[PDB]
Amino acid sequence: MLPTAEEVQKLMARYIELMDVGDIEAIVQMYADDATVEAPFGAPPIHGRERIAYFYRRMLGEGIARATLTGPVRASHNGTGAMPFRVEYVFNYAMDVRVEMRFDEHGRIQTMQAYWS
């Protein structure tokens, strides 16, 4: 069965925590088997869990400082939710990210679109 509104926030609230600490391996396992990431939305989709790992290694790999919610987690009963948030980095940077997410019956991320500022 599809994860409830409750379970979605529990899973999506966890996303921002794994981002803030920059846990790549953990986030990659949140995603379903042949999941799609569209980040930013308008660029070619990233199919497969393998290539998603690289996207997150692009974003986090360098070393993130913070990743914090800039609005409420809008969870639906269709196993989908969106949340506007922000990421900040340490270099010798910041960006407003607004992810929408779709969960399968197994509680994993099927599709993400992310809109960057």
Author numbering: 0 to 91, 95 to 119
Q: What's the paper's own text on this?
A:
The final sequences have 19 to 24 mutations compared to the starting template. To evaluate the accuracy of the computational design, we sought to determine the experimental structures of the designed binders. Alignment of the experimental structures to the corresponding design models showed that there is an atomic‐level agreement with overall backbone Cα root mean square deviation (RMSD) of 1.8 Å for Sam0.2 and 1.7 Å for Sam0.7. Further analysis of the per‐residue deviations revealed that regions with the highest mismatch (Cα RMSD per residue > 3 Å) correspond to the outer rim of the Sam binding site (e.g., R56–M58, A64, F95, A96, D119–V121 for Sam0.7).
As proof‐of‐concept, we designed protein binders to target three distinct epitopes on two different oncogenic targets; vascular endothelial growth factor (VEGF) and interleukin‐7 receptor‐α (IL‐7Rα). Using the described strategy, we sought to design proteins able to prevent activation of the VEGF receptor (VEGFR) by quenching the receptor‐binding site of VEGF. We selected eight of the best‐scoring Sam designs (Sam0.1 – Sam0.8) for experimental validation.
